[PDB]
């Protein structure tokens, strides 16, 4: 669906703007962490590309990524907000309803990206694995990973990316 492609374009640009604004990001900022390899196990027509919008302050990055995702979702027709709990369950093993999604994605991000296995991961080059992705035949679903330069920040990006690629099914 084109609800997909134009919504990920909206959210990939809300991310970018908010990181610049709230975290003083730039594409001319030497990243601490670098997205190395990018791997789709079962790829049925998706391209993932990485975009560098790095910055020092990783909690600024987490809140900026929360703000973008709050908005983008709240900017959904109630009919298409209806489909979001199903993506939650399929990607994060979490149960939710439309009125609950914001607090529940919220509470998952800071549990998961404040955990010690994320915050204390200081390995420079980090890869991203997604299980599956489908695109329209002649229309590749084009996704963008926004590398924030931190491990705490990419953790929130990747979770969005997990929900998104599950939407393509």
């Amino acid at each position, epitope marked *: 669906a084109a609800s997909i492609q134009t919504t990920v374009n909206t959210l990939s640009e809300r991310i970018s703007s908010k990181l610049e604004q709230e975290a003083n990001a*730039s594409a001319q*900022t030497k990243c*601490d962490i670098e997205i190395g390899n990018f791997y789709i196990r079962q790829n049925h027509g998706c391209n993932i590309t990485v975009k560098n919008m790095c910055s020092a302050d*990783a*909690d600024a990055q987490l809140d900026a990524v929360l703000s973008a995702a709050t908005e983008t979702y709240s900017g959904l027709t109630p009919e298409q907000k209806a489909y979001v709990p199903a993506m939650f369950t399929a990607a994060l093993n979490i149960q939710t309803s439309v009125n609950t999604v914001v607090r529940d994605f919220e509470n998952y991000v800071k549990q998961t990206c404040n955990s010690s296995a994320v*915050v204390d991961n200081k390995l420079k080059i980090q890869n991203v694995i997604i299980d599956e992705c489908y695109g329209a035949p002649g229309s590749p679903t084009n996704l963008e990973f926004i590398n924030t330069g931190s*491990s705490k920040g990419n953790c929130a990006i990747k979770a969005l990316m997990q929900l998104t690629t599950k939407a393509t099914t």
Partner: antibody
Framework: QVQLVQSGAEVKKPGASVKVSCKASGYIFTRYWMHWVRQAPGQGLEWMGYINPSTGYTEYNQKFKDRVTMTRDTSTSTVYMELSSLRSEDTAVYYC????????????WGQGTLVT | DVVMTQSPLSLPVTLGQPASISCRSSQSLVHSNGNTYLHWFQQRPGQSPRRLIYKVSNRFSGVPDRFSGSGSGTDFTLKISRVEAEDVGVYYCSQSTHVPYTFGGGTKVEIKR
């Protein structure tokens, strides 16, 4: 107005360890990277590495990959630096520097710390 | 690694006259992103470093316009148009394109007599 306070001079015996430090002031700590440069007596500068204070990420010069351990303290705005196994050549001044917003230029230097 | 060579090592300069210092690199310093990450610093005698020029030509806040920088690729030049007694000192060039960041060996500027 940005300000970088460093600890005073030191004299260690060959093979031991020392810890310099670097209290900061005047800017949001976690928003800027902190470097560390050493200058031998009557010698040019030499880059040791940096630290991100929001996260702890570090990146050392290989010359001291096993001997330096840059550290932070989000509460006291203080960036430490421990050189272990001090040799005779390790005697020098040690400045800490703040970065711009791209981690590409040194915008604020400290004052110095002569360790010998 | 990137080796920076500064030349000359010593520069007696008549008060009020121009002056030029040179910096060469063992590898090009033009980054993929378009910028060249070369910079100059002044060290007043025994004091600590003091900012000067960044990215070949731009000057930090509170930096006299007599200071000025130029060059391209792998050979760069700094120029003090008129040399006041406060400009005595060692000038260092640095690069930050290639980790680790590296500095040249310095040039000493002194008034001539």
């Amino acid at each position: 107005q940005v300000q970088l306070v460093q600890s005073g001079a030191e004299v260690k015996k060959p093979g031991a360890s020392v810890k310099v430090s670097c209290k900061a002031s005047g800017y949001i700590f976690t928003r800027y990277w902190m470097h560390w440069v050493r200058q031998a007596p009557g010698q040019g500068l030499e880059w040791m590495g940096y630290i991100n204070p929001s996260t702890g990420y570090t990146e050392y010069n290989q010359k001291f990959k096993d001997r330096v351990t840059m550290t932070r303290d989000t509460s006291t705005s203080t960036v430490y630096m421990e050189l272990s196994s001090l040799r005779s050549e390790d005697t020098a001044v040690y400045y800490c520097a703040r970065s711009d917003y791209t981690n590409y230029v040194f915008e604020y230097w400290g004052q110095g710390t002569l360790v010998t | 690694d990137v080796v920076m060579t500064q030349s000359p090592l010593s520069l007696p300069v008549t008060l009020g006259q121009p002056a030029s210092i040179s910096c060469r690199s063992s590898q090009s310093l033009v980054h993929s992103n378009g910028n060249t990450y070369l910079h100059w610093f002044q060290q007043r005698p025994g004091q600590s470093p003091r900012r000067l020029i960044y990215k070949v030509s731009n000057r930090f806040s509170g930096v006299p316009d007599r200071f000025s920088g130029s060059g391209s690729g792998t050979d760069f030049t700094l120029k003090i148009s008129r040399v006041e007694a406060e400009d005595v000192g060692v000038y260092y060039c640095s690069q930050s394109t290639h980790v680790p960041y590296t500095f040249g060996g310095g040039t000493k500027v002194e008034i001539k007599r």
